[PDB]
Symmetry: D2
Subunit: 338 residues, 4 copies
């Protein structure tokens, strides 16, 4: 038996009762979902920008970040639908700290019940300020505690091909983006969109902390996220291949480009050069780039498991580069529209 311990877990209803969505928060989520929805459905020419830390490890810095990006959101609101990256669970290449929910105190105490309280509280506050949130849905149980406060979800490169994750995505209430695979493979994400578009029947855990059988309807609001592979995949020809690829699979030829991870070749400031290309293509009149993803924090760089506004997982651009980038992208959209 390779189970050392079983410890009790507060059900989703405990967290949803202790921290109910406020009316303003319920409204943030609703609008961001239908805004992201029309960006996908043609209807609105703005760019979805999902940006924020690689991981949330500090609610204080999280909130300082939030107020600064909410400011920029209201400014750039006519060009950009800015959603903040509030990533609570992190996929490791082997082992490592898996995010705030799993180990809030960053010493290996795994106080997951606190992790969940802290996480839902923070997510409530940010959404209540009027700023929408985005998260990676990695774990299969935590979605119930958080999904109602999320306006967009990502399925990571390491899990796009997983049927379990494509099943989860077909019953989420928010739009979802599928990262291409670690090696560059586009085909797994394309399949994943088609798979998540269908109804599925599977086993999941209810708001009451009990397993049950779930039938989903399928999620039409899914799109690919170009995130690099063995080499970058943000460029025009790459984008072109993915567009004819997506049209051959029967799906809207529209992409979100992630400036980070393998697209910034692990070189975070390169995120701005990726930005320069994408902005040059947006400004060039490239309709299909529907959204982008960027990893920023208050201070650039990263640490390892302690500084204040700096990432403890992936390296991010800091706030002045963030502001700059966001301005570029908006100007590029402006140019694209007229």
């Amino acid at each position: 038996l390779r189970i050392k311990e079983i410890k009790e877990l507060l059900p989703p209803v405990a967290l949803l009762e202790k921290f109910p969505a406020t009316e303003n928060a319920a409204n943030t989520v609703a609008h961001a979902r239908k805004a992201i929805h029309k960006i996908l459905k043609g209807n609105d020419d703005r760019l979805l920008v999902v940006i924020g830390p690689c991981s949330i490890h500090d609610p204080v810095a999280a909130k300082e970040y939030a107020t600064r990006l909410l400011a920029l959101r209201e400014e750039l609101k006519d060009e950009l639908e800015i959603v903040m990256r509030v990533y609570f669970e992190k996929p490791r290449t082997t082992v490592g700290w898996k995010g705030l929910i799993n180990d809030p105190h960053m010493d290996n105490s795994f106080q997951i019940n606190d992790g969940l309280r802290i996480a839902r509280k923070l997510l409530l506050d940010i959404n209540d300020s009027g700023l929408p949130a985005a998260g990676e849905f990695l774990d299969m149980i935590t979605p119930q505690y958080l999904a109602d406060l999320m306006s967009w979800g990502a399925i990571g490169a390491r899990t796009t091909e997983s049927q379990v994750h494509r099943e989860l995505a077909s019953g989420l209430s928010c739009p979802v983006g599928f990262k291409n695979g670690t090696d560059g493979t586009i085909k797994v994400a394309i399949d994943a969109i088609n798979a998540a578009g269908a109804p599925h029947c599977f086993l999941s855990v209810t708001k009451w902390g009990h397993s049950a059988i779930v039938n989903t309807s399928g999620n039409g609001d899914c799109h690919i996220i170009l995130r690099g592979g063995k080499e970058p995949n943000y460029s025009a020809k790459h984008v072109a291949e993915v567009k004819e690829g997506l049209n051959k699979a029967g799906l809207p030829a529209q992409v979100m480009i992630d400036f980070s991870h393998a697209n910034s070749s692990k070189q975070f400031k390169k995120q701005m050069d990726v930005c320069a290309d994408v902005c040059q293509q947006i400004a060039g009149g490239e309709k299909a780039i529907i959204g982008v993803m960027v990893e920023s924090h208050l201070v650039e760089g990263n640490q390892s498991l302690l500084a204040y506004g700096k990432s403890i997982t992936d390296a991010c651009i800091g706030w002045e580069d963030t502001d700059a980038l966001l301005r570029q992208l908006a100007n590029a959209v402006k140019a694209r529209r007229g």
Copy 2:
């Protein structure tokens, strides 16, 4: 909101009470796990052969195939540890029938509670006759209904990179093998072994159908499964590359070779050609090929979702070649040792 229905699910304890492991069943499981443990520890020289249908879709044909194989298990137990493939859940490239548990009646009725009863009864019978079983652990909730009757598990190509699956593997009581990824990537499986080797803390569902926090020990008994990519990866060249990679990563250099899927270029009869090559290597002295995987059924080929013992998912070799193969492999094992 995108969930169309929630239906109740019998907890693991209902299935474990209606169908407890008999003393014979329990003994099969224990000895098979010990066996594969010595083989992986290197202090036994026999080959692990995980063979059987691609998917179980018919308990009658499955009980038949099991007694036919038990004959060969007993007949070859000094050169080979034969474990039957009792795969109840299947990973689709997009959509399709996901296995017997998910849809036992192969019309889309999703009678998962029956699915689970049928699945646990069949697994009990096969184990009680003295034949061990192997399954793919795809879903996160079904393990509790079945893992005590499983002597080896596989994590599939589409989920080896998934942290959720590596977490599951670190707390399973049986040895586990990690398929390399769909395109050929060896590195994800190597990472997966290292990942699954560590203790993890995560959320899972207990025998009582309730979520809880779980801590694992890490599973020492995990190995890679070479299953092909864009290119076959069974040859002696590939087996050296993979052994060396494992050495860099500080892992025992051992592999299980899967004769099927991308190694047999998806046409089943090529499994005999892979068999020839691998027997050649084993006989020639390759100490590292620790196990193999083959997809066989009573009748060969496959059919689309209906002929008694033919596969309804991947094409398999039929019985004559199966018997032949188990012997090519057994002779090849005698030859590797003196």
Copy 3:
């Protein structure tokens, strides 16, 4: 804190899966409930006889008794609907052994999970042979494990006035009888019938071992059980007072007379004297004595927690007396009839 321990409890569904009602078991229950319905609705002139041990403490002796009583049940079937007392939970005046479910091994080990398995098995066997069962519904959680195999329920003297019990009775699928209170009070039972006749909404535990809100419909098949008080209340005097009382309260004037407990002044053999009196009433034309209750076992008397077919709680008449009594009652029904 005055809680020494919490230990896990198999959900109703574990017991209902391990021991499903067979088709015979199901038809016993259905037919007996329809029978007692027909008697309480006044369409059939037979007498309901609920007879059997005070408590079940030994499945062997219970099975022996069941065989003997089943025989008498088919012999006497034209005048009597004989239901066996299979009482698994017992109300103590202060402390004592609370029944087989609570402590199956009569040493204070409280192996309630075994208790429940033993109890449901035994109840299944008795019912499957074609003999109906009657139980006291004392505890609020155990009903889910047993009620589908019960053809009549009693609410005890010490709990008739309890709202919790009257709530339980309004949602039971079998007829229910309310004992008058310990002191003789008729009024509490009359109120209890009216209370249980109404819809109630309250909290209970589901087949899955989880609390939920329950709305019941109300149970029209409830009647009083005259069980004595500070003095006996079986005489025709008493039966007229109680019929009139029921008329005032707008209830059908019908009674079940219990020959035991305070009606037999706690010494068992007096049950035959009460039997004589009540047979004399029935024969003389008393249409209202709808049923009776008697405490019998194989061997007469009782012991203290060991002899075989002897009660370990209240003293009972033994099998010889039982056969005689049952013959007396049948003849009296035959006289009443003409």
Copy 4:
């Protein structure tokens, strides 16, 4: 078959997370339980006074009652340990509104999840201000949502004889009092004290909303509550009868007298007459009357189901002036008993 529907129920942990006991709330509960423990143990000779509405049906009127009673609690805290009656579940003689938790909105809507929220919030507020609470434990599942904020529990006349209730009482953290039975029977309550004094093993629902097997230790802090029967049973005559019966039973000879229900012949006003009799006894040296129970509200009487603000919708209560007066009488009488 006879069940028309099943609806979901928030587990105890949802309520305990949304409304945790504050540090003040926790302190109130602790000291009140310790206090009643020492009265019941004979180390303090103050009188326990459990007083308040028959039923809580209005959190606004209930909070006001609580600030007034809290005021009186601090001025009389030298002779009386005053605990407020916060009764959320009510036993009906046949059918009727079963209390705030069961039907908070008093139209039969049965919004029990709201009922529980409302009930735990109110109980938290009252305790956090520093006023202890008392409830009847009628239902077997609701205890998990409320017992940590309760400083004393009662088991009603209609359930004292029920084993299920005596099992619950043996594992409650607060002292418990057992009403004698509707008809006057003392013996059922005496048995219930002895029964609740022993360890029990039974099935109950955990903080997580799941059934489990529970072993309790037995509750030493239980006492009888004289509440009348076919006749009143408050007189020193009756108190003498009941005192030797508890001794014959092996129990400390101590009683709580309830001035209401069958002791006040169901007309509320009579509670003052009972008060006079019992004060007379206490002053005269009757060391066995350990506590009392009274039903009061802001406004006297009761009313049938807009409502008249602080008035009972179940049993008739004395109103606030009579309450203040009564509490003063009792405190003076406690003074006459120690010399």
